[PDB]
């Protein structure tokens, strides 16, 4: 197996600015009502300064990146708030969880709410003012009258109305007196009582209902640097009503909230606070400061409200721009996303007691592709699609010539201002396709000369796209859920080959069986958007797989009488336990004419289908999930891609690397542990005492360890019907691995993205707070 280590791709990381959990806490239940709290869809949104918003599942410590909505050039995001209704109870006592709406901004005078099914901008709304900087929705105390409150540059609190799928500027509450009073932070003390933190060192407590100014809190001069007027950067309110406010001298103020004044001034960071977060019972305060620092707060026991800075840490590489809490269903975390593009999850209730976890900054979809016949490697971001050629083998080089071995071949631009979702290529690379959520464009290429092959029928734009191996069929995922296909016809002439696309022919997915309270509650029909699309090696059977784990397959009925029919065994093909993170045909043909469909879901669930039979392969009948090797089973790396060999399937997440000889069968991170959702327990260096021993028998001999707390016949038949696997961690930040040609020998492109201080945005220091 030959490997090319490729760093030279400059995939741009961007600053996370916003982090929004759907819910923050759920009311606790016992294990007997786990089935009650089971179907509550819990998602986590994160927004990036290239206007990227993305939807993640925490997935019980799983952290699967599911959906990416790209935003165009000179478009970004700053604030993010989910809007979750309380649960509706049906006429039979059945429950309907809240339809969750998701709202963001664009550094503008413009709010926009995001539809998640069609996976683009549902709505916009704009009251006339300066630029909206901070916003949140009124909490519950009416039941259906809930409203946005947005603070902006010039001052005027605007009040926006969201009732029954609406988003409209209701009115202006008030504006501040002066013109230099800029608003930066907003949070709600109670139902009617809003708190804004604002530019001239002030914290205004307004009553919203009348719209009056209940009290003006005030802060003093920043006596470290100049620029007198301190800037409250972030405010929240504790669940028992006091107010906490991170500022520009890095202090953290404890305002008694009954009379709206101070009781404590804690010095936390060196540079300025950037975000606060709180436990939902009101017991853990997390401070995040521009000196790439996170600090952690618990009350000084005893006298009232004297909080304390238990400890701090330097977590990220660049500073922590936003962080948000969540606590429930056996999971108690807080996510800090910063400018170094790396969301880190922290264990809220296990802090100092459990290791944090860095997610990959890279998209879960691998975003790299290649034509091995053409030996053309490529990737894409915002609008530029870049292609390199390798021109050469490896064994030829088996040094001085590697510089010319790699080659910046092409970099193509896209008209308009959309950002590119996905792209598909022919195996010889002559044919290219680009999927924006407004348009899809085809490109013919010649060893170079390009031409823009034109698409008809579309104009609404797509998230996924796949070119058939025979280069006859083009299938896209448009509006996420609506997969369409067209034939492409290759017409040869004396100048060469050209290509014409037919009308896009819509094919229809299957009406599954889902309860209507499930269809209404949560996010709604969100999961329907197809995650992945896989052609057969002969392009004779296509399959799709959505976020719900439903898989839908189609066969090709030839006679142009070629037309794709629904596979009748698609009814037999069942829906998974979790999200199908990879799905591909084996290129190796069967002996019965069936295909073999490799499937992995994010719970490290490995399997393979005989789709024409609508049932599993017999090797999959043999090998079960616990039969998997533990290096596969305990990695917590969401497995990013497979590559194929003859009898082997190599797997790569972000970090690790695997291979499996699928012909054969099979014979540290503890498994019995019950944790909060980030990583595995500390073994050496923690501030908590891990062993505490009591002693009776004053001669010391007797001790006590005081604890710390607040298919037998199936495998019989599976063996009555009757290794080579390998793993490593030694390639850490892999964005993408794609095979290339020139148990068979194969070359491959490994492509990594180490994070460099050259890549991240620059640091900033004054004379005072110079680091070490």
């Amino acid at each position: 197996m030959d490997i090319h280590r490729c760093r030279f791709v400059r995939y741009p990381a961007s600053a996370i600015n916003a982090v929004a959990f759907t819910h923050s806490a759920l009311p606790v239940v016992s294990s007997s009502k786990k089935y009650l709290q089971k179907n509550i869809q819990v998602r986590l949104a994160i927004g990036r300064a290239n206007g990227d918003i993305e939807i993640w599942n925490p997935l019980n410590g799983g952290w699967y990146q599911e959906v990416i909505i790209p935003g165009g050039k000179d478009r970004s995001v700053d604030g993010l708030v989910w809007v979750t209704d309380p649960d509706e109870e049906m006429a039979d006592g059945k429950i309907i969880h809240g339809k969750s709406r998701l709202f963001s901004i664009g550094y503008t005078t413009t709010i926009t709410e995001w539809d998640l099914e069609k996976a683009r901008a549902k709505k916009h709304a704009s009251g006339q003012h300066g630029e909206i900087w901070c916003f949140g929705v009124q909490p519950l105390p009416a039941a259906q009258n809930r409203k946005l409150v947005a603070g902006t540059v010039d001052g005027n609190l605007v009040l926006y109305s969201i009732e029954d799928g609406d988003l409209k500027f209701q009115k202006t509450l008030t504006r501040t007196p002066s013109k230099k009073t800029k608003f930066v932070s907003i949070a709600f003390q109670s139902h009617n009582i809003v708190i804004v933190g604002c530019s001239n060192s002030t914290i205004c407590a307004y009553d919203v209902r009348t719209g009056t100014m209940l009290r003006q809190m005030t802060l003093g001069t920043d006596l470290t640097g100049g620029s007198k007027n301190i800037i409250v950067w972030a405010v929240k309110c504790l669940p028992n009503g006091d107010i906490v406010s991170g500022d520009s001298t890095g202090q953290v103020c404890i305002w008694d909230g009954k009379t709206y004044t101070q009781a404590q001034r804690i010095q936390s960071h060196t540079q300025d606070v950037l975000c606060l977060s709180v436990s939902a019972d009101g017991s853990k305060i997390i401070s995040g400061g521009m000196d790439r620092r996170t600090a952690v707060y618990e009350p000084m026991a005893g006298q009232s409200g004297r909080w304390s800075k238990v400890f701090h840490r330097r977590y990220h590489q660049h500073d922590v721009k936003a962080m948000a809490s969540f606590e429930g269903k056996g999971m108690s975390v807080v996510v800090s996303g910063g400018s170094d593009a790396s969301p880190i999850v922290l264990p809220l209730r296990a802090l100092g007691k459990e290791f944090h976890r860095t997610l990959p900054h890279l998209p879960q979809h691998p975003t790299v592709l290649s034509a091995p016949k053409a030996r053309y490697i490529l990737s894409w971001w915002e609008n530029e699609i870049r292609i390199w050629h390798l021109l050469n083998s490896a064994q030829q080089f088996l040094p001085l010539n590697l510089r010319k071995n790699r080659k910046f071949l092409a970099q193509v631009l896209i008209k308009g201002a959309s950002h590119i979702t996905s792209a598909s290529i022919s195996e010889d690379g002559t044919l290219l396709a680009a999927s924006t959520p407004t348009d899809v464009k085809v490109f013919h290429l010649d060893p170079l000369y390009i031409k823009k092959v034109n698409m008809t029928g579309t104009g609404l734009g797509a998230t996924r796209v796949q070119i058939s191996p025979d280069k006859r069929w083009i299938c896209w995922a448009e509006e996420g859920s609506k997969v369409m296909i067209s034939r492409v016809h290759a017409t040869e002439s004396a100048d060469g080959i050209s290509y014409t696309v037919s009308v896009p022919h819509k094919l229809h997915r299957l009406r599954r069986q889902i309860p209507k309270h499930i269809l209404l509650g949560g996010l709604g029909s969100y999961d329907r958007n197809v995650s992945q699309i896989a052609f057969s090696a002969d392009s004779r059977m296509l399959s799709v797989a959505d976020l719900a784990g439903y898989i839908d397959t189609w066969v090709l009925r030839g006679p142009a009488g070629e037309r794709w029919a629904r596979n009748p065994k698609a009814a037999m093909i069942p829906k998974l336990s979790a999200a199908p993170v990879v799905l591909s045909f084996s290129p190796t043909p069967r002996d019965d004419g069936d295909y073999d469909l490799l499937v992995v879901t994010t719970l490290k669930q490995l399997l393979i289908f005989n789709p024409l039979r609508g049932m599993l392969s017999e090797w999959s009948r043999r090998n079960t999930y616990p039969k998997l090797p533990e290096p596969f089973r305990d990695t917590r790396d969401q497995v990013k891609g497979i590559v194929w060999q003859g009898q082997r399937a190599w797997f790569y997440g972000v970090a690790s690397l695997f291979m499996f000889d699928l012909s054969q069968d099979f014979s540290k991170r503890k498994r019995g542990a019950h944790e909060s959702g980030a990583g595995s327990k500390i073994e050496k260096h923690s501030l908590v005492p891990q062993r505490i021993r009591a002693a009776s028998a004053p001669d010391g001999t007797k001790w006590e360890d005081i604890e710390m707390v607040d298919g037998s016949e199936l495998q019989r038949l599976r063996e009555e019907n009757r290794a080579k696997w390998w793993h490593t961690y030694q390639f850490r930040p892999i964005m993408g691995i794609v095979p290339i040609e020139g148990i068979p020998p194969l070359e491959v492109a490994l492509i990594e993205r180490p994070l460099s201080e050259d890549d991240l945005p620059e640091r900033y220091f004054a004379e005072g707070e110079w680091e070490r």
């Binding site: 404590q264 001034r265 804690i266 010095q267 936390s268 618990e298 000084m300 026991a301 005893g302 004297r306 304390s308 800075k309 238990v310 400890f311 100092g352 007691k353 260096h685 923690s686 501030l687 908590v688 005492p689 891990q690 062993r691 505490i692 021993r693 009591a694 002693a695 009776s696 004053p698 001669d699 010391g700 005081i706 604890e707 710390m708 707390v709 607040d710």
Partner: protein, 276 residues
């Protein structure tokens, strides 16, 4: 310790005596128990035992193991008889080697304690609500606050005065006053040598500094001119306690060694004066 035997308080002595190198045991004594040379064995613990001290009255004691703390609550109330001196002892690992510690009581009773450990790692952990963390099988989470200044070994952490302030003296020649109600730290930075030992006066008014180069100065608090000075011969010493900072295998390792005669002379025209 002063403690009531029947209605008569007196001084019990509390020693920590080894039985191996790796372990020791604390034995308490009356005057007359000393006279008969027999003592009450209270707790034998078993990690290279460093220290013991004792709280107001005799309600509790503390002993210092390498990674760990041994805290002793007396069992009964009021100490009716001399023989019912039994202490329910619990132990627990401090995250770093215990260089020193100092207690503070929470009050005719003792309602809780908060005890501060200081470690050669360069850290100062404080423990906040001990008696009710430990009096009640299962107990809740505990977590020291971590206060980190020095790079070298903290020689001595003491609770202050009120109990508002935490003062500290280290190798790096600088006495820190941790604010402990805010986050801040205000400090007397330039001493002639390592701050080796401090104690807080009866009232909060004076500090005593045993400066590691064999001297002592008494300060008043917040005026910081030394109202009192006493120095010694300042020479090179084969020191009995080996070190405070040589516990964790520092890059240059401290060895108590002497490599040269101590260069010195006597003065003609003033024979009372020696230069060294």
């Amino acid at each position: 310790d002063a403690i009531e035997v029947a209605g008569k308080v007196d001084d019990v002595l509390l020693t920590l005596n080894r039985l191996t190198k790796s372990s020791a045991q604390i034995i308490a004594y009356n005057s007359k128990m000393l006279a008969t040379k027999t003592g009450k064995l209270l707790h034998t613990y078993d990690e290279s035992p460093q220290s013991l001290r004792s709280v107001a009255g005799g309600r509790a004691i503390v002993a210092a193991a390498k990674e760990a703390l041994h805290i002793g609550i007396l069992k009964t109330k009021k100490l009716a008889s001399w023989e019912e001196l039994a202490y329910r002892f619990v132990s627990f690992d401090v995250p770093d080697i215990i260089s020193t510690f100092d207690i503070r009581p929470i009050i005719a009773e003792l309602q809780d304690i908060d005890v501060a450990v200081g470690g050669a790692r360069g850290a100062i952990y404080v423990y906040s609500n001990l008696l009710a963390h430990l009096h009640t099988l299962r107990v809740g989470t505990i977590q020291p606050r971590k206060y980190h200044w020095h790079r070298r070994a903290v020689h001595s952490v003491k609770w202050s005065g009120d109990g508002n302030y935490l003062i500290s003296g280290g190798y790096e020649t600088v006495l820190v006053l941790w604010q402990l109600d805010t986050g801040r730290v205000d400090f007397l930075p330039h001493l002639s040598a390592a701050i080796e030992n401090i104690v807080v006066s009866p009232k909060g008014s004076a500090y005593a500094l045993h400066l590691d180069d064999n001297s002592a100065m008494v300060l008043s608090t917040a005026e910081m001119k030394p109202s009192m000075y006493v120095s010694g011969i300042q020479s090179l010493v084969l020191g009995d306690r080996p070190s405070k900072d040589a516990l964790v295998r520092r890059v240059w390792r401290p060895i108590d060694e002497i490599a040269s005669p101590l260069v010195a002379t006597i003065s003609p025209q003033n024979p009372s004066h020696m230069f060294l």
